[PDB]
């Protein structure tokens, strides 16, 4: 029962229970003909469906499967696809006749204070989010999906993350030791998810049942953070580190009292925007940082909103300019993708290409 | 019941059951006084014992970074070793330990198909953090590395994974082959004492210890995935799906050497007549600049009581004629001497006194 359904009204991996491991990849389409892209997505639909279920010769041919996931369980594997702005208009030229179908809010995220964006660390035409409760299962799924795109796409970047939840179900803690996700509404609340995440109208029909996905690769200066006092740490966020409770409250789930937390507190500024998003982030570590000599670690920030201009960008502007966490963080990758709606069993992903 | 004992006759993490995740780090000692190193090892012993088992001033930084608070120890083990530079660095013996150097501790010989990065191998101290949860393991490494600031400088930090079968099958590496069939059973004390554990002939601090070989081997996943199934099985000498040697039925059947290729990986290794305890992990590190492909490979880690007799012969054989050379390139190399176990009232490598 470790299988997450692939076909559905929405794509899996958004309101799906947060897995432990993620591989996050972005592709740039190198094919000139649109029919190559339809071929891509057709084989991706077939492969993803095989990978997300338990579906398991000519010795002179390559094996159709790389093989490292053979004895493993699906471990709640989900794969989520999205389109960046470059898929519809690249350098002003709309190369596949899709400019008339561009999502209404799909564009590069605005530059923000404290940005240190690496251009090849964000963007892309296609993004693939592979989530699973086992890293080998997840890398295996991404590896075999990327192999299908050779000749059609060029891999732009590949990110890799983790986020462990509590043994008794406690909110998972990020690399600063604070629980991450209390502020999210319940993914089992259909009304709120339809109000925060899922699109019903106002978009091209392929976005119905879809959403927007924001990606920010945020470096976390662990060495500076670990020298900061516990009180300094609790004051940057506005919650007690151990319990995850707001200031002046008892438990994690008590409501936030804004007049009880600092003005430049992370939670204060975000909740003060009046907007909500669905945060589904993962932590990352990447060895040492050259010239820095410290652990290169941080957060792969991923959130889903039906209107990023109303829900995400106001929060980004607020946090970018005034935020105690900026003292310990620097965003180095940025991207916004449009996720199509779900895939019915007889169709292929994003079948608006026809 | 997810706890691996830290105190013992040997260090944990060598013959201990292979966990899923590893963080592998190497440090260079920047401290000039040997007593700063003794302090470091004491606090490392104290912290490690708290970390590997289950375990107040808001104005001070937290003594624990906290991200593992709600997690199980998940068989966390931490294993320590010393590189050659700890005993003699640039001709200088910096801590009066040259008279205590292990007999077989030295940099590994340069090999054909080597492409070594100097800062991807070597080091004076190595720390191996293994656990069945990556967050648990990184947390253990993070807080151990925090205690070394001002005493050591971190040389490199590697990060790996290796998942075993849902029903206990041998874990498969990123080439899809079962990896570990050839190791003796780590529950055979007689075999482990003959392959891994040191009994005599070494300084007393190595009694119950071993040597640890580290080879960071890049795996050209893109070349391998385009190769025929015949190329893949012929490079190893075992069937990919079953893990069986050629002309044999099951994975654990003995290898028939006259039925696998001469330059086969299993042929060359088995032909040395030597054995080691292989405890490796797979790694992935994003894309490779200039290559544009997945940067992945194997963190080769193995334990031998005599690297000059057991490991170096196998390296020479494989370096020259291994069919795996077509899909792999070693980019990091290191050999560490791991001290023996730690009794409850002592600290790691207490021979420093
Ligand atoms: C390294 C980067 C970040 C870290 C470590 C971090 C951590 C946290 C923590 C500990 C909380 C409080 C617990 C919770 O509500 O889950 C929180 C809340 C929140 N964060 Fe972040 N966060 C980061 C980046 C961001 C970014 C980039 C955004 C938006 C652009 C964002 C939006 C929010 C929101 C909306 C909340 C909930 C506010 C509420 O309670 O109503 N976070 N974050
Ligand atoms: C990317 C690098 C490597 C890969 C993918 C790899 C993989 C494998 C595989 C699939 C086997 C057969 C199953 C088994 O016996 O466990 C094997 C056997 C073995 N390999 Fe490796 N290996 C690599 C590097 C090395 C290195 C660097 C050494 C030694 C310097 C080594 C020594 C051995 C030994 C001793 C055996 C068992 C021989 C026997 O069957 O008696 N391997 N390896």
Per-position DSSP letters for B58-123, written without gaps between them: TTS--SS--TTTTS--TT-EEEEEE-GGGT-BTTB--SS-GGG--TT-SPPPP-TTB---GGGS--
Residues B340, B7 contacting (CB under 8 angstroms): no
From chain A, pick out residues whose CB is under 8 angstroms from the CB of B227: 62
User: How far does the centroid of ligand 2 lie from the alpha carbon of residue B313, in Å?
Assistant: 14
Total Cβ atoms within 10 A of residue B235: 24
In this structure, chain A runs to a length of 354
Give the CA radius of gyration of chain B.
Answer: 20
Method: X-ray
Spatial separation of the C-alpha atoms in residues B84 and A156, rounded to whole Å: 40
Residues B337, B206 contacting (CB under 8 angstroms): yes
Query: Quick one: tokens of A284?
Result: 């990352």
Torsion of CA A136, A137, A138, A142, to 10 degrees: 100
SS3 A349: coil
Residues B306, B133 contacting (CB under 8 angstroms): no
How many interchain CB pairs under 8 A, A with B? 166
Spatial separation of the C-alpha atoms in residues B19 and B78, rounded to whole Å: 12
Cβ partners under 8 Å of residue A193, min gap 6: A15, A185, A187, A278
Spatial separation of the C-alpha atoms in residues A29 and A172, rounded to whole Å: 35
**Given CB atoms, is A70 within the 8 Å cutoff of chain B?**
yes
Q: Which helix (DSSP H) or strand (DSSP E) does residue A300 occupy?
A: strand A295-305
Residues A337, A229 contacting (CB under 8 angstroms): no
Spatial separation of the C-alpha atoms in residues B77 and B129, rounded to whole Å: 6
Spatial separation of the C-alpha atoms in residues A145 and A162, rounded to whole Å: 20
Spatial separation of the C-alpha atoms in residues B291 and B196, rounded to whole Å: 38
**Given CB atoms, is A182 within the 8 Å cutoff of chain B?**
no
A323 CB near ligand 1 (under 6 Å): no
Cβ partners under 8 Å of residue A207, min gap 6: A103, A199, A338, A339, A340, A341
The region that residue A193 occupies, defined by phi over 0 for left and psi between -120 and 50 for alpha, beta otherwise, is alpha
Alpha-helix runs per DSSP H in B186-297: 189-195, 221-226, 229-236, 265-271
Q: Which helix (DSSP H) or strand (DSSP E) does residue B131 occupy?
A: strand B125-131
Residues B338, B212 contacting (CB under 8 angstroms): yes
Query: Quick one: tokens of A255?
Result: 């409501």
Spatial separation of the C-alpha atoms in residues B106 and A272, rounded to whole Å: 61
| Of B35, B212, B2, residue with least CA distance to B126 | B212
Spatial separation of the C-alpha atoms in residues A342 and A49, rounded to whole Å: 13
Maximum pairwise Cα distance, chain A: 70
Strand partners, B27: B125, B154
Spatial separation of the C-alpha atoms in residues B119 and B114, rounded to whole Å: 14
Task: Scan residues 212-271 of A and list those with Cβ closer than 8 Å to B.
Answer: 222, 226-231, 233-234, 241-242
Q: Give which of A226, A281, A300 to mutate to test B binding, by max B Cβ within 10 Å.
A: A226
CA distances from B178 to B221, B243, B255 (A): 16, 6, 15
Q: Which helix (DSSP H) or strand (DSSP E) does residue B151 occupy?
A: none
CA distances from B202 to B10, B103, B346 (A): 15, 7, 20
What angle, 0 to 180 degrees and rounded to 10, lies between the N-to-C axes of helices B34-51 and B134-146?
Answer: 150
Spatial separation of the C-alpha atoms in residues A218 and A333, rounded to whole Å: 7
Q: Do B172 and A21 touch (CB under 8 A)?
A: no
CA distances from A201 to A198, A204, A269, A347 (A): 10, 8, 30, 21
Query: SS3 sequence, A68-94?
Result: CCCCCCCCCCEEEEEECHHHCCECCEC
Cβ partners under 8 Å of residue B191, min gap 6: B184, B185
Q: Do A230 and B172 touch (CB under 8 A)?
A: no
Residues B130, B77 contacting (CB under 8 angstroms): yes
From chain B, pick out residues whose CB is under 8 angstroms from the CB of A148: none
B314 CB near ligand 2 (under 6 Å): yes
| Of B338, B335, B333, residue with least CA distance to B119 | B333
Q: Report angle CA B117, B331, B228 to the nearest 5 degrees.
A: 155
Spatial separation of the C-alpha atoms in residues B125 and B83, rounded to whole Å: 6
Q: Is B345 exposed, middle or buried (0-12, 13-18, 19+ CB in 10 A)?
A: exposed
Spatial separation of the C-alpha atoms in residues A163 and A173, rounded to whole Å: 7
If you write DSSP's letter for every residue of B164-184 in order, what string do you get? Answer: PPTTSPPPB-TTSSB--TTSP
**Given CB atoms, is A206 within the 8 Å cutoff of chain B?**
no
Chain B nearest-CA distance from A26, in A, is 11
User: How far does the centroid of ligand 1 lie from the alpha carbon of residue A157, in Å?
Assistant: 24
Total Cβ atoms within 10 A of residue A275: 18
Maximum pairwise Cα distance, chain B: 70
Task: Name the phi and psi angles at B157, rounded to 5.
Answer: -135, 115
């Amino acid at each position: 029962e470790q299988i997450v359904p692939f076909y559905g009204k929405h794509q899996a991996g958004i309101t799906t229970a947060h897995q432990t491991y993620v591989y996050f990849a972005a592709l740039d389409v190198t094919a000139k003909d649109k029919s190559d892209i339809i071929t891509l997505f057709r084989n991706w639909t077939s492969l993803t469906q095989m990978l997300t279920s338990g579906k398991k010769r000519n010795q002179y041919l390559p094996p159709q499967d790389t093989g490292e996931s053979a004895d493993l369980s699906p471990s709640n594997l989900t794969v989520t696809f999205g389109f960046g702005p470059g898929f519809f208009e690249k350098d002003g030229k709309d190369r596949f006749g899709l400019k008339s179908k561009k999502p209404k809010h799909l564009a590069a995220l605005p530059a923000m204070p404290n940005d240190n964006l690496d251009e090849k660390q964000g963007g892309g035409d296609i993004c693939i989010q592979v989530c699973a409760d086992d890293e080998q299962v997840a890398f295996h799924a991404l590896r075999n999906l990327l192999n299908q795109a050779v000749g059609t796409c060029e891999v732009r970047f590949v990110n890799k993350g983790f986020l462990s939840g509590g043994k008794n179900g406690e909110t998972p803690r990020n690399l600063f030791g604070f629980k991450d996700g209390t502020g999210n509404q319940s993914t089992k609340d259909d009304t709120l998810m339809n109000s925060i995440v899922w699109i019903q109208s106002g978009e091209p029909d392929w976005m119905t049942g879809g959403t927007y996905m924001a990606f920010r690769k945020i470096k976390m200066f662990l060495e500076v953070w670990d020298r900061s006092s516990l009180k300094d740490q609790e004051d940057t966020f506005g919650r007690r580190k151990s319990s995850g409770a707001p200031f002046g409250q008892k438990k994690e789930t008590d409501p936030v009292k804004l007049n009880q937390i600092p003005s430049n507190s992370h939670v204060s500024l975000a909740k003060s925007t009046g907007k909500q998003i669905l945060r589904r982030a993962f932590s990352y570590t990447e060895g040492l940082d050259p010239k820095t000599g410290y652990m290169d670690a941080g957060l792969l920030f991923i959130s889903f909103q039906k209107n990023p201009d109303n829900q995400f960008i106001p929060m980004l502007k607020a946090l970018s300019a005034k935020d105690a966490l900026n003292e310990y963080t620097q965003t180095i990758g940025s991207a916004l993708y449009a996720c199509p709606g779900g895939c019915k069993k007889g169709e292929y992903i994003a079948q608006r290409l026809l």
